[PDB]
Amino acid sequence: SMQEKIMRELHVKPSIDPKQEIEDRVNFLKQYVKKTGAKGFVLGISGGQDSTLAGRLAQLAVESIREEGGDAQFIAVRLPHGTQQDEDDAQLALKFIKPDKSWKFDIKSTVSAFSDQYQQETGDQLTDFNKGNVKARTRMIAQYAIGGQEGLLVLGTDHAAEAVTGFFTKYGDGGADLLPLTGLTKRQGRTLLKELGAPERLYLKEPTADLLDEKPQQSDETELGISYDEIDDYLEGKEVSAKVSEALEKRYSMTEHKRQVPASMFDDWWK
Amino acid sequence: SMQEKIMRELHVKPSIDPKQEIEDRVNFLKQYVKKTGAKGFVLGISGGQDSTLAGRLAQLAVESIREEGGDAQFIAVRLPHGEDDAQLALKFIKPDKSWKFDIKSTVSAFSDQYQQETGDQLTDFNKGNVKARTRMIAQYAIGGQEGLLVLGTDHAAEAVTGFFTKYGDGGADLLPLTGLTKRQGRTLLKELGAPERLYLGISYDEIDDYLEGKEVSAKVSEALEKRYSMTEHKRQVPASMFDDWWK
Numbered sequence A: 001s002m003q004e005k006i007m008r009e010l011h012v013k014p015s016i017d018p019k020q021e022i023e024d025r026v027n028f029l030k031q032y033v034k035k036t037g038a039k040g041f042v043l044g045i046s047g048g049q050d051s052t053l054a055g056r057l058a059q060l061a062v063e064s065i066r067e068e069g070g071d072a073q074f075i076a077v078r079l080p081h082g083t084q085q086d087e088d089d090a091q092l093a094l095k096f097i098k099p100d101k102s103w104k105f106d107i108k109s110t111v112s113a114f115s116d117q118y119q120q121e122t123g124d125q126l127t128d129f130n131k132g133n134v135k136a137r138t139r140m141i142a143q144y145a146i147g148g149q150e151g152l153l154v155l156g157t158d159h160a161a162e163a164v165t166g167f168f169t170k171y172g173d174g175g176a177d178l179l180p181l182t183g184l185t186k187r188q189g190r191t192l193l194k195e196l197g198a199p200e201r202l203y204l205k206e207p208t209a210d211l212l213d214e215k216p217q218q219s220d221e222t223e224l225g226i227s228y229d230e231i232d233d234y235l236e237g238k239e240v241s242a243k244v245s246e247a248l249e250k251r252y253s254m255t256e257h258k259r260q261v262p263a264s265m266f267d268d269w270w271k
Numbered sequence B: 001s002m003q004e005k006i007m008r009e010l011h012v013k014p015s016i017d018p019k020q021e022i023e024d025r026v027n028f029l030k031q032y033v034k035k036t037g038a039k040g041f042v043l044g045i046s047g048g049q050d051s052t053l054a055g056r057l058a059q060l061a062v063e064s065i066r067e068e069g070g071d072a073q074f075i076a077v078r079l080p081h082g083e084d085d086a087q088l089a090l091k092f093i094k095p096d097k098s099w100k101f102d103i104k105s106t107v108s109a110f111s112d113q114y115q116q117e118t119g120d121q122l123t124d125f126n127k128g129n130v131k132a133r134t135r136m137i138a139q140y141a142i143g144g145q146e147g148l149l150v151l152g153t154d155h156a157a158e159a160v161t162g163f164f165t166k167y168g169d170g171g172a173d174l175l176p177l178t179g180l181t182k183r184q185g186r187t188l189l190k191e192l193g194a195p196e197r198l199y200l201g202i203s204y205d206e207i208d209d210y211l212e213g214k215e216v217s218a219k220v221s222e223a224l225e226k227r228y229s230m231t232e233h234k235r236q237v238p239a240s241m242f243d244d245w246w247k
């Protein structure tokens, strides 16, 4: 079935061993930074589930490297666009992650400069949506700037529950050097957070990209028209209603370009 | 050999037929844009060989679609930071639309913000990557606003050394130049009737020799094969524990 195919392609496991998943992912982070010779990692901490989990894994990874005699550091960075509605949750996340370094970069001035320039050049005002993507892509630039200046790798937060819908910004939050959450469903991510002892609030808030000026904190589920419980059931191979299968398989097919490098005439995935 | 593996992985042909390459690459653009149902393409025009070639192919592609009764447009955009060659490229490409977006104010806002937030000045090298990534945002902003696909200028001679900014000029939706070495691209521009001025630690001709399957000194192949290995991350999606190419 297509469900089984998508499951394989996204590396999802119907049932997991929380402790073992954490070791595998921390071990991957260690192996990768060791191979590349990088000084550590950098990641934007939004206060949301995904960055909280990836962030804690990163801190654990560098603490493990130092413990064994190596050198590594993790820079957690707040990337608010002006005043962030849920800054308090981002602070709670930082409190849990306990990163080596806690930095901050307000992207508003950069996004405003770009937005003002766009209107000046074209006479058109960016739609709230397109301006939102400028925000997501500016956060990418900020993390890579810190990464290039400090010699760190940029961590990405993509996972199966996001990959299946393609709900992320190409070259924005989708742009990163390595991904510790690949294959995890949304509920499985929560399970790892539980194993890591995160404060319940960090995994009970509605997932949101929060990129719109006119509709801040817009939930993923509202925009997608499907819940994470349905998405996770589908990914974990459970028996789901036909409506869920049709919806997800349609989105997966349409967003394949987001999961592949740029298309060339030698590729067949787009035909 | 490693040279054969790389040659194969980058889709390089030792010998090419200029006219058919143009036909195949124009047909690729047409086929992809129709499949996705997009309204056309957008590409930053720098005045350099690569963007001049990709741009002309893009324009030929949209004119062909319209000739066959479809709807398509190509937006060529200048992305200066704060020119004659670019102007010349535009005169040759003859795009449906000619836009411009000065990235200066954006990069400056970012640079000043970085300094005030970290107390550190953005070095020249890192600021350069910011400029490249800002051009990416600019092209994608236009693409998102106008329903257009972002074209990339990547080719074999550029891919092998991985010398391009990840998520900068490396960020695009489709690549019409894949597989071509630097001189083959030059050959295509020549066949397209482009003026000489437009198509004219290691040299490009040396790199093209390696890619096209010619004999090269150890120092060369050694360096190129190592450069390739260390920049593989630029030719793949973000690395996960399920990947092995980085090992």
Ligand SMILES: Nc1ncnc2c1ncn2[C@@H]1O[C@H](COP(=O)(O)CP(=O)(O)OP(=O)(O)O)[C@@H](O)[C@H]1O
Pocket (backbone or CB within 6 Å): A043, A044, A045, A046, A047, A048, A049, A050, A051, A052, A077, A078, A079, A080, A081, A084, A139, A157, A173, A205, A206, A207, A208, A209, A210
């Ligand atoms: N305001 C912000 N501050 C810092 N980083 C941010 C940010 N908004 C987005 N990011 C970065 O972009 C990534 C993607 O964001 P999201 O898609 O919303 C997942 P999340 O926000 O981390 O958990 P979530 O599903 O609870 O929303 C985040 O994990 C984070 O690295």
Ligand SMILES: [Mg+2]
Pocket (backbone or CB within 6 Å): A050, A157, A162, A167, A168, A173
């Ligand atoms: Mg996300």
Ligand SMILES: [Mg+2]
Pocket (backbone or CB within 6 Å): A046, A048, A207, A208, A209, A210
């Ligand atoms: Mg979020």
Ligand SMILES: [Mg+2]
Pocket (backbone or CB within 6 Å): B118, B119, B120
């Ligand atoms: Mg300092």
